[PDB]
């Protein structure tokens, strides 16, 4: 429908946090352009895990770092990692070990991916793609770590572009707004945060996973062989207001 | 070859600065995709202006406001406007009536067009693209017009994002980084310039006018949906390093 459906026929992707929600839907998107995906996660096989003949769903906890080592090492190609893999334990975040916690699957996991991918995009050139936030822009009082996290996302994306780029590598990240996924069903459970958020979005609706696919999909291909080192907002304008 | 061939079949473009370099580029890349394309500019038929059958020509200061008022009421439809237009005199900046001639071309008429526009994009929705710079972020000694004007635009973008999302109108800009084209061949005559440039560029090279065509082509489709206010660069890395 916008991308030919074929452009990313013979190529190999993997998705961390591929198992639902945007992580799900940028799997399935790059799948139904003709790659070959592996994605990653917890609840492999769940209801929301992307099926298609080109996704292989493995089960895997990034922080377990031989095991992620184990399954780079296996690859005989790739050419997109999409670090999207990410956690928010809320107000819990203000205790250290889960501030932590969440640093080390956020950041810690996408740095290991994206060295553990760097030989294999080297090969041919090819590209990462992080996932970043509203929050890599405004502070939440109610998720430092997750905020923290995602301000050093950003800033390790704009790094390694200006390591990679030598070895033909382009670095990227999307910057999505509020995006309406099973992950939080309990964020519109709230009507007063759902009023303030759609009273601050230009496009007064939710984003969809779809949306931050297709980005995802442009961001990794041929049409943007001059783009590294940037953040994509994919928000309805949220950013703005 | 990255978008489905008919993307924008049926839809009209008015490419604003169409006659040569970016504008040029960015012109064909719409009519490649389907469009009708109306692009504007000085020396509307010279060596360098886009030649197409879909692509019509038109000699058109865009400061003359009477002028563009009657381009835009004469079209039976419009879908997307890129604001391309845009001159830099350099030093002679610092003389005011230079700056505020610069700021006249690059903002008065991007504003212009944009509300001439409104109307039309308002009737099914569509978008806007304006152009910014790396000049949007970093100052410019040798141009503070064009850097002002640059700032303004990003700002502009932001606002009418805001204002025109109701009438189901986006509005995105891109910033493009040292883009190799006819319009600014002296600068690569400029030794010192160049090294300067490609040192602090992590892919080493010259962005080309295609290249910024296919972001504009993303921005301005149904795959950018949840875009809008958004600033994506097309700069090899250059605002990283």
Redesign the interface.
């Known amino acids: ?4 459906h074929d ?1 990313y026929a013979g190529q190999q992707v993997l998705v961390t946090g591929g198992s639902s929600g945007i992580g799900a839907a940028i799997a399935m998107q790059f799948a139904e352009l003709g790659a070959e995906v592996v994605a990653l996660g917890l609840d492999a096989d769940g209801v929301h895990a992307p099926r298609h003949p080109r996704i292989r769903r493995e089960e895997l906890d990034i922080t377990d770092s031989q095991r992620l080592q184990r399954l780079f090492e296996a690859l005989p190609r790739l050419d997109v990692l999409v670090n999207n893999a990410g956690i928010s334990r809320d107000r819990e975040e203000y205790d250290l070990a889960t501030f932590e916690r969440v640093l080390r699957l956020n950041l810690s996991a996408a740095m290991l991916a994206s060295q553990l991918a760097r030989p294999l995009l080297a090969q041919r050139g090819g590209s990462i793609l992080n996932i970043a936030s509203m929050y890599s822009t405004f502070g939440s009082a109610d998720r430092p770590a997750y905020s923290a996290s995602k301000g050093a996302i950003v800033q390790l994306t ?2 390694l ?2 390591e990679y ?2 070895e033909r590598i382009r670095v990227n990240a999307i910057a999505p ?1 509020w995006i309406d996924t099973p992950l939080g069903a309990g964020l519109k459970a709230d009507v007063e945060a759902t009023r303030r958020i759609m009273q601050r979005t ?3 609706r939710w ?2 996973a779809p ?2 696919a ?2 995802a ?2 961001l990794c ?10 953040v ?6 949220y ?3």
């Open positions: 429908m916008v991308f030919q452009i704009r790094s572009a200006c780029a030598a707004g230009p496009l007064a984003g969809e949306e931050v297709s980005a999909a442009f291909g041929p049409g943007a062989s001059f783009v590294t080192g940037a994509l907002a994919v928000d309805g304008g950013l703005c207001a």
